Amino acid sequence: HHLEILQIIKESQQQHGLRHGDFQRYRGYCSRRQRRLRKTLNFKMGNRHKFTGKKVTEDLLTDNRYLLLVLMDAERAWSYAMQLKQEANTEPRKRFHLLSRLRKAVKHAEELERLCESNRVDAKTKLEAQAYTAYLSGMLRFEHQEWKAAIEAFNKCKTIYEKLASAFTEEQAVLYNQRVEEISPNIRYCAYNIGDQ
Amino acid sequence: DQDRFICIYPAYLNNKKTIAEGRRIPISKAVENPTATEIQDVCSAVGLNVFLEKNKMYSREWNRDVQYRGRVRVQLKQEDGSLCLVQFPSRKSVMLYAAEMIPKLKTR
Amino acid sequence: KKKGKLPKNYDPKVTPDPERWLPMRERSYYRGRKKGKKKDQIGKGTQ
RNA sequence: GGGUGUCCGCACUAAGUUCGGCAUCAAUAUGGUGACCUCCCGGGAGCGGGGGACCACCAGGUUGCCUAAGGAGGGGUGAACCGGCCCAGGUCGGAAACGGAGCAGGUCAAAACUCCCGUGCUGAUCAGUAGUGGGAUCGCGCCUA
Ligand SMILES: [K+]
Ligand SMILES: [K+]
Ligand SMILES: [K+]
Ligand SMILES: [K+]
Ligand SMILES: [K+]
Ligand SMILES: [Mg+2]
Ligand SMILES: [Mg+2]
Ligand SMILES: [Mg+2]
Ligand SMILES: [Mg+2]
Ligand SMILES: [Mg+2]
Ligand SMILES: [Mg+2]
Ligand SMILES: [Mg+2]
Ligand SMILES: [Mg+2]
Ligand SMILES: [Mg+2]
Ligand SMILES: [Mg+2]
Ligand SMILES: [Mg+2]
Ligand SMILES: [Mg+2]
Ligand SMILES: [Mg+2]
Ligand SMILES: [Mg+2]
Ligand SMILES: [Mg+2]
Ligand SMILES: [Mg+2]
Ligand SMILES: [Mg+2]
Ligand SMILES: [Mg+2]
Ligand SMILES: [Mg+2]
Ligand SMILES: [Mg+2]
Ligand SMILES: [Mg+2]
Ligand SMILES: [Mg+2]
Ligand SMILES: [Mg+2]
Ligand SMILES: [Mg+2]
Ligand SMILES: [Mg+2]
Ligand SMILES: [Mg+2]
Ligand SMILES: [Mg+2]
Ligand SMILES: [Mg+2]
Ligand SMILES: [Mg+2]
Question: Could you give all domains of chain A from N- to C-terminal order, each with its CATH number?
Answer without folding.
Answer: 1-197 (1.10.3450.40)
